Amino acid sequence: RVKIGHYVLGDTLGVGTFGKVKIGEHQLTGHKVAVKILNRQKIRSLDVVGKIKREIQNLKLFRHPHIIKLYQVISTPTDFFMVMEYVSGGELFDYICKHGRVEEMEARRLFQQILSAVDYCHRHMVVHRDLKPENVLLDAHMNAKIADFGLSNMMSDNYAAPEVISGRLYAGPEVDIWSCGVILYALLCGTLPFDDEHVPTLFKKIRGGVFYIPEYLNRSVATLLMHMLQVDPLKRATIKDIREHEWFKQDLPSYLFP
């Protein structure tokens, strides 16, 4: 049984290809952390050590109320221990899959926190790492948190942008907006904007750029979504295009874009 300070490592929160994430618990106060364990032998084998090393150093600097905070890194000759903030409310996509669509006012609130987080990354993240929906979580207070814990791989019971699926070399921040578009749709509707049992038809839809907007959504939010999910990146919204929007400006806390 591995121990770090007063934190005793127990349950496995999520497993990725590079390593595992085990939840540790303070024995005295009951405070929880998330520890990403990265085996040296496994990551030398996958030849990704440098990339990870630099990702950690970058993350050390980060300071955002909606991105996962790295407290300290413990480096033993065999493993890397990344002690990070603990999240208790699981995935956002699982919450939507389980408890239906989100009330409009809450959909906006979560989306404001998410875009803020993506904006921080585009500003400070040196080499671009694409935003993935499975990396948007929820804390005890129902706030969105961006973390790489690999919960979607754990089992108990839209896919990619039009330029991504076309196989060309794409601009990351542009694909992130498209990715933020599907999340907003997921929030407001409870389903994914491009969805079909027949797979080749799914990609046709994504490349076609035509989707369904339910009658319960106003033109305002619909016209933001129609702008975020444009196939041609040259016409696709930027973060500031979203920030100047009628629907997005409403009840926006001024701290999210300082």
Regarding whether 111 and 221 lie in a shared domain, the answer is yes
Could you tell me the residue range of the domain that residue 189 belongs to?
87-258
Q: What is the resolution of this structure in A?
A: 3.0
Tell whether residue 13 is among the known ligand binding residues: yes
Query: Which residues precede a break in the chain, with C-to-N distance above 2.5 Å?
Result: 157
Distance (Å, whole) CA 183 – CA 177: 10
Domain boundary (68, 86, 104) is at 86
Regarding whether 64 and 142 lie in a shared domain, the answer is no
Regarding whether 114 and 74 lie in a shared domain, the answer is no
Contacts of 15 (CB under 8 A, 6+ apart): 21, 150, 153, 154
Long-range contacts of 196-205 (CB under 8 A, 24+ apart): 202/159, 203/159, 203/165
Tell me the two tokens of residue 22.
Answer: 């085990």
Positions of E strands within the chain = 3-4, 7-15, 20-26, 32-39, 70-75, 79-85, 136-138, 144-146
Q: If you ran DSSP here, which 8-state letter would residue 67 be given?
A: B
- The domain total for the chain is 2
Instruction: Decide: 175 and 163 in contact? Cβ < 8 Å.
Output: yes
Tell whether residue 209 is among the known ligand binding residues: no
136-138 and 144-146 as β-strands: parallel, antiparallel, unpaired?
antiparallel
Domain boundary (64, 86, 108) is at 86
Distance (Å, whole) CA 82 – CA 250: 37
Instruction: Decide: 72 and 124 in contact? Cβ < 8 Å.
Output: no
Regarding whether 57 and 99 lie in a shared domain, the answer is no
Domain boundary (25, 58, 86) is at 86
Regarding whether 99 and 77 lie in a shared domain, the answer is no
- This structure was determined by X-ray
Write out the catalytic residue numbers.
Answer: 130
Regarding whether 72 and 156 lie in a shared domain, the answer is no
Tell whether residue 20 is among the known ligand binding residues: yes
Regarding whether 60 and 72 lie in a shared domain, the answer is yes
CATH of the domain at 34: 3.30.200.20
Regarding whether 78 and 153 lie in a shared domain, the answer is no
Regarding whether 101 and 53 lie in a shared domain, the answer is no
Distance (Å, whole) CA 52 – CA 4: 21
Distance (Å, whole) CA 41 – CA 18: 10
Regarding whether 133 and 49 lie in a shared domain, the answer is no
Indicate the SS3 state at residue 13. Answer: strand
Tell whether residue 53 is among the known ligand binding residues: no
Regarding whether 19 and 131 lie in a shared domain, the answer is no
Tell me the two tokens of residue 198.
Answer: 């027949």
Regarding whether 130 and 8 lie in a shared domain, the answer is no
Tell whether residue 145 is among the known ligand binding residues: no
